[PDB]
Structures are given as C-alpha cells and as structure tokens.
Design a protein around this ligand. Structure first.
Ligand SMILES: O=C(O)c1cccnc1C(=O)O
Ligand code: SF4
Ligand SMILES: [Cl-]
Length: 302
C-alpha cells in the first residue's frame, strides 16, 4: 500500500519531470519521497537553482506561492489547495494600511508566513532565521511587524528596536508550549539541550538553551556535542533531525501537530502527480509587487 503508493509517486515524478520540495513539517513518508526538505525560503531558493520547470510543493499555500513568486516560469502544483496558515490569514491589507498611516516612519516588516497579497504591501520580508539580522540592518529604530507577535517581541529583545506587532495577538498554535514542559525534561534528561522556536511564548524561550528556526535547529548539533536534544517545534522536525544526526537523540518537548501541514498525504500526493494539479497561479502584478520586499530582504542579508 505505502510501497504501492510510494513506487507510483517515484515513478510519475521521474516520468513527468517533477522535483518534489517538502517542508520540514510534512509527515515523514512525504519527507522521504522529497528531493529536498527544508524551511520556506530554503525551498524557494533551491527551486531557483533547478533546471527543471515542474515543482510539486509539499507544505502550505503561502510557501508554494513563495516558490512561485521566485520561480514565475515554473509550474508549481500542490496536492491540497486548502492547506493554509490561519495565523497568516488573520493579517489583512486593511490592518497594514491602518498602521502605515499611524506610523509612517516605521517600515513594514512582514514575516514569511503571510499572504502573498500582504507581501505586496510590505517593505521587507523576513524569516525566523534572519528576522533579527533584517531588523538590525534597517535604518529605523521602530518597525511594524507581523503577523506573529512572539517572533516580533523576540526581535525587539534582540535588536533593542521598538517593534509594533500586528494584528492583535497574532500567534501560531503549534508553538504554544508551556514552560512546565521544560521543567519536566530538565529533571528527566539533566544533560539534554532544549531548543525552541522563536514563535514560542517568552517564558518558553527564556527557559531554553537555544532559540532557533528549523534551519538553525538543524545546525546546532554541528557545534554542540550533546547526546540529547529536546525540540520545541512541530513534530515533523524530529524526523528531519534524526535523519541528519542518527547518532543523537531527539525528543519532542511536547506533541505538537500542524493540522494544515498534515492535510498532505501519500494518497493526495499521488493524485497530484496523476492529474498534474493543483497549479499555484498568481496574478503577474502580484508577483512583481511581492518580489520587491523579498529582494530587499536578500539585499540586507549580503
Ligand atoms: O520558514 C519556514 O519554513 C517556517 C514556517 C513556519 C514556522 N517555522 C519555520 C521555520 O523555518 O522554522
Ligand atoms: S506551523 Fe504555525 S506558523 Fe507554520 S503554517 Fe502551521 S500555524 Fe502557521
Ligand atoms: Cl522561472
């Protein structure tokens, strides 16, 4: 059944010239059939290097749209067109326009987990991995930041700059661990290092040894020799990590599952390659507009 499905997927992939890009939060079966697994930007950038012009993207809509923005002349298909980010969808163009009005000297820094429509209105895009570098390099000492309040406050702490978060209480449900969980693993594994996402609430960040994006997580065992790592993010990272460091132990801080990331399965992936749908299409003017704050991001980096 799974061999059945996987064999067919690996068959139709080669036969129809698709590259498969999976996000770190995908079920391990989909990570294993992917050509590259990574975070949002890493996958879009990799896609820019490829000679192939057909991409099957395994993640959520905004990420597939990011791939499309940076790779306009490539066919990008997703297996579940409803896979989306509810946090991102809470920030609106009306809210952006309201805050630019109130704070005209504050650049609009937009987190990558944001709608493409929102990107068109942003001054610069950022990721969890570069948000600190990006905001530090902007001239202004005050920024408008969205849609994640936690990442925004983390950026404030690290840059010393004033960070106006939008919308009200923008948060990712997957990363709302409680600090008690850290207290518990510390007693259970006294020599374990705890790594948590910057999207986590402040108490959780303050009690961890490391705060990092998924991409940063993947690099910490290259320099930290510890046997055991407690990982405070979506469960799919545990599989990525174990694969890259089979010599260490990776313990989820808690079971945390993104419902939308899990909408992608072997079955609907197979259907995607069969039908060559669903294609990610954006208006050309949306692409042209959203590219500006993304290119601005590359420039500051680098
Ligand atoms: O940019 C991403 O892919 C991303 C999206 C949501 C949460 N975390 C990450 C990460 O890389 O750590
Ligand atoms: S894991 Fe969080 S930040 Fe990523 S798509 Fe799901 S709700 Fe959004
Ligand atoms: Cl292209």
């Amino acid at each position: 059944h799974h061999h059945h499905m996987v064999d067919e997927i690996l068959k139709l992939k080669k036969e129809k010239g698709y590259i498969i890009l999976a996000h770190n939060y995908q079920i391990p079966e989909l990570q294993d059939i992917a050509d590259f697994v990574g975070d949002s930007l890493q996958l879009a950038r990799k896609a820019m290097e490829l000679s192939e012009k057909k991409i099957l993207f395994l993640g959520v809509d905004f990420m597939a749209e990011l791939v499309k923005i940076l790779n306009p002349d490539k066919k990008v298909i997703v297996p579940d067109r409803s896979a989306t980010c509810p946090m991102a969808n809470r920030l609106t163009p009306e809210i952006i326009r309201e805050y630019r009005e109130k704070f005209p000297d504050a650049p609009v820094v937009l987190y990558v987990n944001s709608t493409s429509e929102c990107k068109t209105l942003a001054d610069v895009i950022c990721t969890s991995a570069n948000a600190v570098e990006v905001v530090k390099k902007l001239d202004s000492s005050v920024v408008i930041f969205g849609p994640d309040r936690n990442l925004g406050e983390y950026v404030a702490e690290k840059t010393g700059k004033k960070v106006i978060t939008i919308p009200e209480n923008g948060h990712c449900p997957v990363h709302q661990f409680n600090a008690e969980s850290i207290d518990a693993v510390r007693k259970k594994y006294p020599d374990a290092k705890v790594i948590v996402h910057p999207e986590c609430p402040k108490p959780v960040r303050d009690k961890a040894d490391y705060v990092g994006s998924t991409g940063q997580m993947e690099k910490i065992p290259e320099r930290d020799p510890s046997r055991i790592f407690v990982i405070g993010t979506e469960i799919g990272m545990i599989h990525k990590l174990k694969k890259k460091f089979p010599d260490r132990e990776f313990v989820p801080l808690e079971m945390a599952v993104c419902v939308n990331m899990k909408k992608n399965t072997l079955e609907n992936t197979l259907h995607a390659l069969q039908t060559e749908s669903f294609e990610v299409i954006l208006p050309k003017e949306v692409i042209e507009k959203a590219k500006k704050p993304i290119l601005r991001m590359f420039e500051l980096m680098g």
